[PDB]
Each structure stands twice: as structure tokens, then as C-alpha cells.
């Protein structure tokens, strides 16, 4: 079940972060798109089906290995989303989150040097949340963040998909 009406909660998450459409430089070595992601989130529940949550996300640093051209990409941001869900069971809920993330992206490379930019990306997430106790809930979700960057400012604009496990505490 969802947090009580008009109550607050806080939480944190760890996840498998994977960047997509990572075109950047012509590195001859490996590009490790898979990284450990991390985030913290807080939320307010309006009714059993609707809540609002805010959080910080660390999406991981992607290396572009190579003997000639090489570099790295990094991204993080703050997000705000509406959480919409309904129960599968009395303790297990299914949900989606929709909103946006304000991100800062940095790239490093010998080719282009150090670059960074800020912008806005939409966030689409879906998952399930299980109430272990009235205060503790665990969640499994997949979060998609679209077009994190800009080809003209940092040379790349990858997408990010993050499969994460999370825990939250409810203060109702």
C-alpha cells in the first residue's frame, strides 16, 4: 500500500546504470556503458494513487578507452516526478513516475578537452513497491532519462536507463 494521505517519506537507491546512444569520439578501445548508479529521493503522498517525489541521481561515469582518442562522460541531476500507482496486493503496488530532471553533464577527452553543460531531460520510470512494514518500503524500478547532453556543447547526448533497488522510510 502507498504512504498515508498527506504524509512524507525519504529514501535512497542503488542501480545498474547503462548509457545508450553514446557517440562521442572515435576511441579504438572499450566504452564501458555499464556503471553503478545511485540516488536519494523524498516524497509526499497525496492519495493512495498519487504522490510527488524529488531526488538526486548519480548516473555514473562512462569511460571511452583507446590508444589514440580517449575520454570519459559523467552525468548527474535533480529530478521531480509525479508517482502514479495502484495495488497488486495489499502490500505490493505497481507504479510509474513521470517528470523531468535538471542535469549537469561533463565530458573529458584528449580530443576536445574538458567540457560541461546543463539542461533538462524528461524522466519515465516504472516499478513495483512493497511495504515491508508500515514505515519501510522497498522498490524495484527502471528509470529512463532521455537526451542527457548536447552534441554542440560536450560532443555527446546519450540516454540513460537505470535498473535500481531502493528503500524508503515513511514518517506518517
Amino acid at each position, epitope marked *: 500500500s502507498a504512504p498515508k494521505d498527506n504524509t512524507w517519506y525519504t529514501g535512497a537507491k542503488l542501480g545498474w546504470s547503462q548509457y545508450h546512444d553514446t557517440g562521442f*569520439i*572515435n576511441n579504438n578501445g572499450p566504452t564501458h556503458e555499464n556503471q553503478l548508479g545511485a540516488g536519494a529521493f523524498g516524497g509526499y503522498q497525496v492519495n493512495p494513487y498519487v504522490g510527488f517525489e524529488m531526488g538526486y541521481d548519480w548516473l555514473g561515469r562512462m569511460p571511452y578507452k583507446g590508444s*589514440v*582518442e580517449n575520454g570519459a562522460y559523467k552525468a548527474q541531476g535533480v529530478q521531480l516526478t509525479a508517482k502514479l500507482g495502484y495495488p497488486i496486493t495489499d502490500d505490493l503496488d505497481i507504479y510509474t513516475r513521470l517528470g523531468g530532471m535538471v542535469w549537469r553533464a561533463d565530458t573529458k*577527452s*584528449n*580530443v*576536445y*578537452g574538458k*567540457n560541461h553543460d546543463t539542461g533538462v531531460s524528461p524522466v519515465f520510470a516504472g516499478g513495483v513497491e512493497y511495504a515491508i512494514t508500515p514505515e519501510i518500503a522497498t522498490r524495484l524500478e527502471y528509470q529512463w532519462t532521455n537526451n542527457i547532453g548536447d*552534441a*554542440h*556543447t*560536450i*560532443g555527446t547526448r546519450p540516454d540513460n536507463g537505470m535498473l535500481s533497488l531502493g528503500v524508503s522510510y515513511r514518517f506518517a
Partner: nanobody
Amino acid sequence: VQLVESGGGLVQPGGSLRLSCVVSGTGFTFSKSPMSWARQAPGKEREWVSAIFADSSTYYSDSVRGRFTISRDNAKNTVYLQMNNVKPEDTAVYYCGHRRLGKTTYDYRGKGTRVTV
């Protein structure tokens, strides 16, 4: 992005010569701009010869390694190609290229400068 090459001329075998490429225009940051030097010899296709990245790392074709030296002066938006111990094979028109963020290729937008050994 505008590129103008200079420094070419007549030189004897074993001689030395320095070419220059001055970058001007808008919409680009020279200090972050990777640059290259290519050449087209008589009756041959254009050959890449050298490149210098934003971190000042340098790269050379085997045909010029140990004889040519690429360098940059970010205060003057200028790239140089110092040519030593020139061979008859070095006779060519030399072009400099500018690579944009988002592209792996260099744009050779200049008129070139001709070296004759």
C-alpha cells in the same frame, strides 16, 4: 570557421620549413578544437600527415614521423607544421583541417600552401 595556410615555398632536400594555419570565425573554441595537417602530392590522393588534440597530444603518419613537428599557439589561433629533412616526396600542397564537436572528421577549408622540394 575560416582557415588560411601559409609558409610554403621552394626548399632544397634536407632543408627545413615551417607552415602555419590561422583559424578564425565564430561558433568554435580554438583551445578545444582538434586540428590536423594533410597534403596532396602531384598525381596522388590527399594524405593525412599530422594531428594535434585539445590536450596538445600529437600524432603523425609514418611517412613524416621523426621529421615533421606539429604545434599550436592558442593565443594566436595558429597551428604550425615544422618540416625538417624534407624529401622529394614532401612536395605537395598542404592543408589544415578543423574538427567540430560531434564529428570524427576534419574539415579542410583552407586554400592550402604548396611546398616544392
